């Protein structure tokens, strides 16, 4: 009944979705062709054939990454009307994805979202998979937020975004398109899950004992965390955490809504052969600074609100035992004005592993979301990165040439300045 709509924007979003929907089909009985040989309601609309269509919209301005979905092994699952293809790429330019080429295709994807929500009596929120350092994921998505916050009212907006790593970088203009989107998507989102790329490379190098995995092994982990988020909307549990209480716990203020991601049991097959994983050790490994899915130091920051989503075979007694040892650890700096600070969700369905996957069959799984203040450190780092580009009129001609005023660039800097000064203000005693 409680059905959610996922929107994938850009090359990164499409490639994340291509691995998340695999495990979405695998966890239920849905075959790649669409057949199954009521828990599947929240993601798969059931037609009368026994064939299930997904509730997702794949949209990209470059057709090159979407045609492999149309000709791949999932060609008979998606609705062909869903996979929206553009004509010309945005090509790392925010203005090309905002004003001129991105303006033509927003009405079609808006109509598709409306017709997908017409068949949705239990609309709860949005699961947006857009990128920050790209062309269409940062520019085309901002128009989508602009339209949905004025057309669909006060609905939940959960972004699973990719943020640029401090060290590993792909484009050379990505500080621009990262800074540009935060001006208007700050007030047009309710929570934003920040994900980098380098920290997950450390995760698959250090915790996973395999060398040279690819983007697929990273998108598999992103699919796993996005599955554990919506575990309480489809399976029975002791304390089900709906999608609405997530932000009742996490976000305190109308301008601090930027939590963090962490997935603890990421061990391999030979590790599962030897070490047994109960609740306490995976809760301890969850709070490790180096197990984080973002390159940041959590000890510098202060946690403000955290929620735990336990999955599999757990009993509540040692869940309540395991969080008490976190209260007495002075190394973890909790904030002085949140004495409760915790939320617990339980599901009885154990996590599943894809065939040919990287993880192994485990019995317990914990996924962590926490509003911290190290994200302000990451934002100050990106602000310093961008500040050594506007000093001498660099790369502006691509922007002011195509329908973007030069007066935007001065305002976004001071808007982010107010944002980080507010973020550091609330972290004090």
């Amino acid at each position: 009944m409680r059905e959610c709509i996922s929107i994938h924007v850009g090359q990164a979003g499409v490639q994340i979705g291509n691995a998340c929907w695999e495990l979405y089909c695998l966890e239920h009985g849905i075959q790649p062709d669409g057949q199954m040989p009521d828990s599947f309601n929240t993601f798969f609309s059931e037609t009368g054939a026994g064939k299930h269509v997904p509730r997702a919209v794949f949209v990209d301005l470059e057709p090159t990454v979407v045609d492999e979905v149309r000709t791949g092994t999932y060609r008979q699952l998606f609705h062909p009307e869903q996979l929206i293809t553009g004509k010309e790429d945005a090509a790392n330019n925010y203005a090309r994805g905002h004003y001129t080429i991105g303006k033509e295709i927003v009405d079609l994807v808006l109509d598709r979202i409306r017709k997908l929500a017409d068949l949705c009596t239990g609309l709860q929120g949005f699961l947006i998979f857009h990128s920050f350092g790209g062309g269409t994921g940062s520019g085309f998505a901002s128009l989508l937020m602009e339209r949905l916050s004025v057309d669909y009212g006060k609905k939940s907006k959960l972004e699973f975004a990719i943020y640029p790593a401090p060290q590993v970088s792909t484009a050379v203009v990505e500080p621009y398109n990262s800074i540009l989107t935060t001006h208007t998507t700050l007030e047009h989102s309710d929570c934003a899950f920040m994900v980098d790329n380098e920290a997950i490379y450390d995760i698959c190098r250090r915790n996973l004992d395999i060398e040279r995995p690819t983007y697929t092994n990273l998108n598999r982990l992103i699919g796993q965390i996005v599955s554990s988020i919506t575990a309480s909307l489809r399976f029975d549990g002791a304390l089900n955490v709906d999608l609405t209480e997530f932000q009742t716990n996490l976000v305190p203020y109308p301008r601090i809504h930027f939590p963090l991601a962490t997935y603890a049991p990421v061990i391999s097959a030979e590790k599962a052969y030897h070490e047994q994983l109960s609740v306490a050790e995976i809760t301890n490994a969850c709070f490790e600074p180096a197990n984080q899915m973002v390159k940041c130091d959590p000890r510098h920051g202060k946690y403000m609100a955290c929620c735990m989503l336990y999955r599999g075979d757990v009993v509540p007694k040692d869940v309540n035992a395991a969080i008490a040892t976190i209260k007495t650890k002075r190394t973890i700096q909790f904030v002085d004005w949140c004495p409760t600070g915790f939320k617990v969700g339980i599901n009885y369905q154990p996590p599943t592993v894809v065939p040919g996957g990287d993880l192994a069959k485990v019995q317990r799984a914990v996924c962590m979301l926490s509003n911290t203040t190290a994200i302000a450190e990451a934002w100050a780092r990106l602000d310093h990165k961008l500040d050594l580009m506007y000093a001498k009129r660099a790369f502006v001609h691509w922007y002011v040439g195509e329908g973007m005023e030069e007066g935007e660039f001065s305002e976004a800097r001071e808007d982010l300045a107010a944002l980080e000064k507010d973020y550091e203000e609330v972290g004090v005693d």
């Binding site: 035992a321 008490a324 040892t325 007495t328």
Partner: protein
């Protein structure tokens, strides 16, 4: 006799000084530590009430910590 060319090269190599024969030499601890691997007090068979007391010991240790 499937490795005859290796031995034919090695002896014609070192028939000048080092004449011998081909053996296989394992390490010493791979020949000493090997697959070669009633009992009064097979264990202190603590059960039930002793397990309860061990859990008690943990619980009031963390309780007096609090």
């Amino acid at each position: 006799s499937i490795f005859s060319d290796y031995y034919d090269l090695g002896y014609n190599m070192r028939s000048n000084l080092f004449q011998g024969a081909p053996q296989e030499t394992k390490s010493l601890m791979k020949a000493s530590y090997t697959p070669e691997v009633l009992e009064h007090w097979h264990g202190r068979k603590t059960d039930d009430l002793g397990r309860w007391h061990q859990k008690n010991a943990m619980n009031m240790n963390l309780q007096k910590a609090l």
